Structure 1
Amino acid sequence: VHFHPFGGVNFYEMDWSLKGDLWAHDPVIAKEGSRWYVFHTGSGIQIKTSEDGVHWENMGWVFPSLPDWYKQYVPEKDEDHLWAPDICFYNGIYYLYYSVSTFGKNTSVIGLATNQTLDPRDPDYEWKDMGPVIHSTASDNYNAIDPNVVFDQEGQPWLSFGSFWSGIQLIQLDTETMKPAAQAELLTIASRGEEPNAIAAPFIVCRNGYYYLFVSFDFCCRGIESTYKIAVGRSKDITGPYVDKNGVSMMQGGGTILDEGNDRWIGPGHCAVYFSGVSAILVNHAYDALKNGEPTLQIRPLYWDDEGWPYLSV
C-alpha cells in the first residue's frame, strides 16, 4: 500500500510476541527505513519506536505544547491528551491526523500535523501544525474523532471518522491540501441503528477490488469492563454500501465480528490493518485482565479466506 509502506517484510513469518513498553490506546503504525513507529492516544500524541516491530520503546510525543486553535473548537478542554492518531505517507510527507475532544461530547475537531520524516535524528524532523481538518459542534449529528485516511484504487484520498451519534462518516480529501474541499459532501457509511450508537474507530483498506471497513463496536475505556469488539464489512465502491458476510448493511448494524476478546484480553478494539507483500497484520489495543485493565498494544497476523474475508489465526 503506497501510503502505508512496509517494504519487503513477511508479517506471517514473524514472531509477534511483543516486548517492551506496550501501554497503548488507539494505535497506528508506520515504518520508515529500518525503524518502526507507533502513534497512540495520550499527552501530545504519544510515540513509540522499534527496530523490529516487536520490541517497543517509548519515544516522546508529537506536540510538547498544544496549538492555541484547539480552543476555538473545544474551549472546555483542559488537559493535553490527544486521541486516535492516524498516519500515512504521501508525496514524501507524513500526514498525522488526530482528535481534539472531551469525553462524552461531540464538540470535537480532527487536526493534521505533518513531518518530512519520522526519525528525530534527521535534521528535517519537525512536526508542523497544519491546523484543523473537520470539526463537529453539539448541533451536529456526528463526532469529529477517530480519523483514518485511505487512498482508493484510483488515487483519491478519503477521510473516514466518527464515534457515536449518527456513526461513521466519509469525506473526500484533496491531494494537495490533504483536507476536504469546503463544499465536499459528508457521507454516513455505518451505524449500529441503535441508541446510543456504539460504533467508532473506522479503518478502511482495499484488497482485491473490495474496500473493507473495520470498526469497533460497543464500549472502550472501562478497563476490564470494556466491551469493545472489532467488526468488518466490505463494498466494491469506497462509498458503500458496506455489507457483512450475511448480506447485512453496516448502516443497519451489519458487521462480521473478527475479535470480541476473551478472559485474558478484554475489549479488543480501535484497530488498524497493514499489508506487506501477501501478508497482513491487525493492530489494536486490548485491556489486560491480568494487569488492572491496562490497555495494551496487540499486533497479530491477519489472514484472508478464499471468499476474501479476513480472519485471525489461532
Structure 2
Amino acid sequence: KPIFKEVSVHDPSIIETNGTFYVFGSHLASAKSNDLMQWQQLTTSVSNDNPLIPNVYEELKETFEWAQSDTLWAADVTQLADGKYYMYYNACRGDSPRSAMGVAVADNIEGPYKNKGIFLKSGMEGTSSDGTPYDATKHPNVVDPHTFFDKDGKLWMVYGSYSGGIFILEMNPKTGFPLPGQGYGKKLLGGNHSRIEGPYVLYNPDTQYYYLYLSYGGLDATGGYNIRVARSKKPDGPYYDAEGNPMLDVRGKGGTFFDDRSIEPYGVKLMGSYTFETENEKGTGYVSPGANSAYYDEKTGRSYLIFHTRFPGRGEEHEVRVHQLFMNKDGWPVAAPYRYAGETLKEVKQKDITGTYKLIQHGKDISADIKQTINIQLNKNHTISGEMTGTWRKTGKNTADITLAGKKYNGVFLRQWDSVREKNVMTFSVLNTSGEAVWGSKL
C-alpha cells in the first residue's frame, strides 16, 4: 500500500520550506515531495528551457566559460534570514578541477534564480583564491557546496570534491557570499586527489554534535561509492570518526591519485552497495549509494538521509532515495535498511525479534562488490547462531545491543516496509566502534 513515485536528481540536496521538501542536484535538476515518498520531477537538465534559471547560458555565462562545460554540478539551495533562497551553483570541466562556484538568489523556491556572481574558482594557472599558486593536491575543487546555519545561527559553507580535499568557509548571512579574507577556508580533511566528495553537515541537538557526511569512492557502478560520516562539537571541526581518528589526517599518499587504500580506514561507513536479493527471493538492493544530504525534523526529532543511488543490474540509472536515520547509544547514526515509508521507532517485543535474519555487512572498504547476505538466527536464549555467532539484547523500547563474531554493535530494532516484496519486516541496524554498519532483515 505504501506508494512511491521515483525521480532522478543526481547529488540531491534536501531543503524543506513550509511543508514541502525539495531536492536540488546536478544539471540544474530538481524534484519535490510532501511525504518524502512520492516525488515530482520538476527539472532535469541545463538548458535555456529550465525555469529555475531562465536563459541560464547567458545568466551564468562566466561560469560556463571558466569551467568549459555546458552543465552544472551539485547545487545546494539554502534559505537565509531575508526569506530568500540562495542557490550555490558550480560547474567543473570534468577532467580537472577547472571550476567556478557562485550564488544566485530567488524570491520563490522554484525560481527564477538571479545570478549574484562567482565567488570561488579552481584550476587557474596562476594565483589561487588563497593567494598561493593553485595546486590541486592541496587546494579544493570548488564544487559540492553545502551552505548551512550552525546551532548559534552562524552561516557556513562546506564544499569540495577530490583534489585537495574538503574545506569550510564562514559566510555572510546578509549577502550569501563568504566573509572576506579566507581564501579557500579551513581544511577539514583530504589531499592528494582522495576519492572523497559531497560533504554535508547536519547538527543533532539531542547528541550535541555536528555530523559531517561524505561520499567515498567513485559515483559510477564500479566506483565503490559509499556514504560515510564523522562528527565534531564545532561546525568547523576538528572532525573525528568512531575510533577517534582525526579526519584531518585523511589523505592519499603524496605523489599518488585516487589512493583508496589510505583513506578506507577513516570515517564511519553507513551504507555501500548491497542486495538482500537471493536465488530464492527478491530483495531491495543498491549500487554506489551516495552524494547525500540529510534532514533533521525539529518537530519530531527524526532524521533522514537523502541520496541518489544506482541499482544492481541497472547500469548507471539512478534515483533519489530517503532512509530514516537513528542515533545509537554512542551518538552515531544508523540508517534504516529499507527506504522511508512512514515507519517510526516503536516499542518492540522480544517475541517479534527472535527468528531468522538475512544479514548485510557494509564493512569498512571502498569496493564495487555488491555485499550479499548471510543467514543468522536470533534465538530465544539471546544467542545468535547460523552463518555467524554472537548475542543479542534489547534495551529499553527498541535499542539493539548486538554482538557478532566478537564485535559489539549498537543501534535499533525497527519494523518497516520492504517495497520490493511488499511486506512488513522486522529489522535491525547497528554500528560498532570501528564504524562498521550491520543490517538485519527478518526471515
Q: TM-score, normalised by structure 1?
A: 0.84
Runs of 4+ more than 6 Å apart:
none
Matches within 5 A, 1:27-106: 27-42=12-27, 45-60=28-43, 61=50, 62-64=52-54, 65-66=56-57, 67-71=60-64, 73-74=66-67, 76-77=68-69, 79=70, 81-91=71-81, 92-106=83-97
Matches within 5 A, 1:98-247: 98-119=89-110, 125-138=111-124, 139-140=134-135, 141-185=139-183, 186-191=185-190, 195-208=192-205, 209-220=208-219, 222=220, 224-247=221-244
| Contact 1:31–1:37 under 8 Å retained in 2 | yes
CA distance in 1, matches of 2:64, 2:228: 34
Matches within 5 A, 1:219-298: 219-220=218-219, 222=220, 224-253=221-250, 254-263=266-275, 264-276=285-297, 277-298=300-321
**CA deviations over 1:170-189 (Å, ceiling 9, x no partner):** 11111111111231251110
Q: TM-score, normalised by structure 2?
A: 0.61
Partner-residue secondary structure (3-state), 2:39: strand
Partner-residue secondary structure (3-state), 1:145: coil
Q: CA deviation at 1:239?
A: 2.0
User: Partner letter of residue 251 of structure 1?
Assistant: L
CA distance in 1, matches of 2:336, 2:39: 23
Unaligned runs of 5+ in 1: 1-14, 120-124
| Contact 1:189–1:250 under 8 Å retained in 2 | yes
| Contact 1:205–1:212 under 8 Å retained in 2 | yes
CA distance in 2, matches of 1:271, 1:261: 15
Compare the two structures and name the one with the higher strand fraction.
1
Distance 1:205 1:36, change over 3 A: closer
CA distance in 2, matches of 1:99, 1:286: 21
CA distance in 2, matches of 1:150, 1:104: 29
**CA deviations over 1:6-58 (Å, ceiling 9, x no partner):** xxxxxxxxx9x67334222100122333433221212xx01212343211222
Match of 1:313 in 2: 336
CA distance in 1, matches of 2:302, 2:212: 18
CA distance in 2, matches of 1:23, 1:280: 22
Number of aligned positions between the proteins: 285
| Contact 2:272–2:289 under 8 Å retained in 1 | yes
| Contact 1:226–1:287 under 8 Å retained in 2 | no
**Once the two structures are aligned, what percentage of the paired residues are identical?**
25
CA distance in 2, matches of 1:137, 1:290: 36
CA distance in 2, matches of 1:129, 1:199: 28
| Larger CA Rg, structure 1 vs 2 | 2
CA distance in 2, matches of 1:33, 1:240: 31
**CA deviations over 1:50-76 (Å, ceiling 9, x no partner):** 3432112221342242222214532x2
Higher relative CO (CA 8 A, sep ≥ 6), structure 1 or 2?
A: 1
Distance 1:198 1:112, change over 3 A: same
Match of 1:12 in 2: none
| Contact 1:100–1:111 under 8 Å retained in 2 | no
The alignment yields a C-alpha RMSD, in angstroms, of 2.0
Distance 1:36 1:306, change over 3 A: same
| Contact 2:53–2:114 under 8 Å retained in 1 | no
Q: Which moved more, 1:108-117 or 1:266-275?
A: 108-117
| Contact 2:9–2:30 under 8 Å retained in 1 | no
CA distance in 2, matches of 1:117, 1:18: 28
Q: CA deviation at 1:273?
A: 0.8
Partner-residue secondary structure (3-state), 1:251: helix
**CA deviations over 1:232-258 (Å, ceiling 9, x no partner):** 111112221100000101122321101
| Contact 2:14–2:294 under 8 Å retained in 1 | no
Unaligned runs of 5+ in 2: 44-49, 125-133, 251-265, 276-284, 338-443
Match of 2:7 in 1: 22
